Write a protein that binds this ligand. Structure first.
Ligand SMILES: CC(=O)N[C@@H]1[C@@H](O)[C@H](O[C@@H]2O[C@H](CO)[C@@H](O)[C@H](O)[C@@H]2O)[C@@H](CO)O[C@H]1O
Ligand SMILES: CC(=O)N[C@@H]1[C@@H](O)[C@H](O[C@@H]2O[C@H](CO)[C@@H](O)[C@H](O)[C@@H]2O)[C@@H](CO)O[C@H]1O
Lengths: 413, 415
């Protein structure tokens, strides 16, 4: 029931390939992905290339995306499209009509927002007749523009961020009705007290909860490369995200997971990949696992943080790397041969402060009491899920999720 | 040499975003309509982030599209000046992702950004060097607007750093295309804004010719009026002002931008204004050329431009000649038919912008300033003034080399 895919980083040109779109290079990339057994790709337009002026959405760029989508479908790959990039791999791609003389908050300016909505509706409507089109993700961790540590953020309130998300997803739904439209925020949404994108936003707006699991976020540094916390980090984000859902079986999509050097050294990447995926597949209701990323980044492109270059499952010339070989069996076995995991009946209480804005959510970050209690329960074999403090004695909430035992971080010690 | 006539080329289909949907036949039709008006050159604009999307990727296809544009121009008798670092165009900043936010690195001082800019300019120049109609490079369109107030987020630099950067950029242009016409082109803050890092000395002493961009929405029309002498003579003023800082007595001054922006120049007055402006400029000797901004109106289906930008063309979106396009063409035809002799300017107004080479009091040259108003009064009186720096006001060798026999101060004119 969990699907298996990759975040597609075009080997020739990286995301700048939209400026030199080569369908045969894309076909060869997708062939090398399909050969490892994946069933979907997550793909990335570059927003200022597609919408260089607020009222110019380039039809040729839309046609190229459709051709990419059709090429993926010929190779047995479904396609999720991320709209607003926005941020990719340390670089911000911002249209000139949003910056300096035209600086206008990405989340609140009425004209920017209507321009974003028309962009997203246009992409979704163009792919709506593709059977392998899964739906849209609003944008790749667009929440990284909304506050620190961004050097120049478009600060917003949680109320403002939620309003914006609902408008963006309405546009996706109007473009492609009935498809799988979601938003996907990086882990500040679960770990930073002040951050305006909240756990509630992730679990209650959009079709599924998307989480992006990256052990350079303090996890590998604090607990160690070969620790239980590092191996279980993706499973933790999946079970943590469930605490805020209103539907007891709302799917959680592990939409990014990668093996970043030096926190996961190259010679440990395959072992880490297998352990991380084994752990997350012991979590019920996982929509899918989508590895970051398909192909190493061309070192002929300068100024990436070193870690970005070697995140591929395939080399830049499409050779299978050790983690690619590894995943291409923690997929064949995970598919077909791995039973859906049993329910997790022990829930750890998550006290994130009252209201829906999670002002104390850093207890969930690496080093926090909720994080460490979850990892302790995990090491003990308890297979924990999570429950909000507000629901810790809510018998209807617990029964709907099959939770029979509730423990606080203090109980765990 | 005699003055040249040309246009700043705004592609009618796609504007400068046409690099993303490059249509050579649309460029050819655009240039056809420009050649019909009798021009002899175009100034053309790469979009820097499209040409160099990563510091170490200068896209071969963008370079080849620029060469194809240059060839289409040469066929039509249009020589080509290429501006490199845009950078700024018509109120929009086009900055590569590798210069901003997480990668914010000063455009003028960061070692890696500056090396990237030099390789980009060298690459463009080398790729066009075999084209006989390639004039040379301009470093970038008013790149000085990134360097301080009123930019909302400037990359600050000292004047010494600005001059060093310019020399490095121009050396790269020269390595790419030896012997061609390489210059830099700064907007009027270089002449008008106290403490602005790009100075009059930089414009008149670095690069092959001095480039001035004349825009009467800079306070000139607002203070003196649309139909005033100051508004009609503003471009000739910048030409003669820029001469004060030249070391060579016959260094050409290129009026590389001049346009008719509404409502400071209403559309119904644009033709009369263009005629008056060009007549005033062509009464100035050693004008390299007049380059009108711009060839084509901007498509109003493109959002968020300041209103004035859309109707700056001499030609409409569908390539029809506008009243100002007819007026400029007639001025060009008149000059080419009569080839009037240049007339020297023997009366010089003293320009005192303070001590040193950084012009700390240059605002006397701005609209409302004592030098500005004295120049316009001498002009109205028919004295045909040039300008001379205070440090040269009694330099007999400097004055004889320019044929200046009369030197007057702003207060002299006050009387
Ligand atoms: C500025 C910076 O590098 N921020 C990073 C994000 O880029 C990163 O986003 C995801 O992680 C991969 C690997 O780093 C990156 O290539 C993609 O942008 C992807 O969307 C984020 C992950 O939590 O971590 C930030 O620190
Ligand atoms: C932010 C802003 O509008 N800055 C303008 C410059 O754009 C302008 O540059 C020149 O003027 C024309 C007409 O405005 C414009 O299309 C081009 O960018 C051109 O290079 C400059 C002129 O001095 O004035 C600034 O205020």
């Amino acid at each position: 029931s969990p699907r298996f895919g990759v975040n597609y980083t075009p080997s020739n040109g990286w995301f700048h390939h939209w400026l030199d779109f080569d369908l045969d290079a894309v076909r060869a990339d997708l062939d090398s992905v399909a050969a490892l057994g994946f069933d979907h790709v997550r793909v990335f337009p570059l927003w200022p290339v597609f919408q260089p002026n607020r009222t110019l959405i380039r039809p040729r760029a839309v046609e190229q995306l459709a051709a990419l989508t059709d090429a993926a479908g010929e190779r047995g790959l479904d396609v999720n499209v991320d709209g607003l990039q926005g941020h990719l791999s340390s670089f911000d791609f911002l249209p000139a009509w949003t910056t300096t003389w035209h600086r206008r908050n990405l989340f609140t300016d009425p004209d920017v927002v209507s321009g974003q909505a028309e962009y997203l509706r246009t992409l979704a409507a163009a792919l709506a007749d593709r059977p392998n089109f899964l739906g849209m993700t609003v944008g790749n961790a667009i929440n990284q523009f909304s506050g620190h540590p961004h050097p120049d953020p478009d600060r917003v309130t949680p109320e403002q961020a939620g309003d914006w998300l609902r408008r963006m997803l309405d546009a996706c739904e109007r473009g492609a009705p009935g498809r799988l439209h979601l938003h996907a925020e990086y882990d500040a949404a679960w770990y930073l007290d002040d951050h305006p994108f909240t756990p509630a936003h992730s679990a209650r707006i959009g079709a599924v909860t998307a989480v992006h699991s990256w052990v350079f976020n303090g996890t590998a540094q604090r607990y160690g490369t070969r620790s239980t916390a590092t191996a279980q980090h993706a499973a933790y984000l999946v079970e943590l995200a469930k605490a805020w859902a209103r539907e007891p079986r709302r799917p959680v999509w592990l939409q990014e997971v990668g093996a970043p050097a030096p926190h996961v050294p190259a010679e440990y990447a395959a072992e880490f990949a297998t352990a991380t995926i084994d752990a997350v597949l012991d979590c019920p209701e996982v929509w899918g696992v989508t590895w970051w990323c398909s192909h190493d980044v061309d070192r002929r492109l300068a100024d990436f943080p070193e870690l970005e270059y070697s995140l591929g499952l395939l080399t830049q010339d499409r050779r299978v790397k050790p983690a690619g070989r590894a995943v291409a069996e923690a997929v064949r076995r995970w598919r077909t041969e791995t039973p859906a995991p049993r329910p997790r009946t022990t829930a750890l209480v998550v006290d994130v402060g009252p209201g829906d804005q999670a002002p104390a959510r850093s207890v969930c970050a690496p080093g926090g009491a909720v994080f460490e209690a979850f990892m302790r329960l995990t090491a003990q074999g308890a297979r924990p899920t999570t429950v909000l403090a507000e629901h810790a004695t809510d018998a209807d909430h617990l029964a709907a999720r099959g939770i029979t035992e509730v423990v606080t971080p203090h109980d765990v010690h």
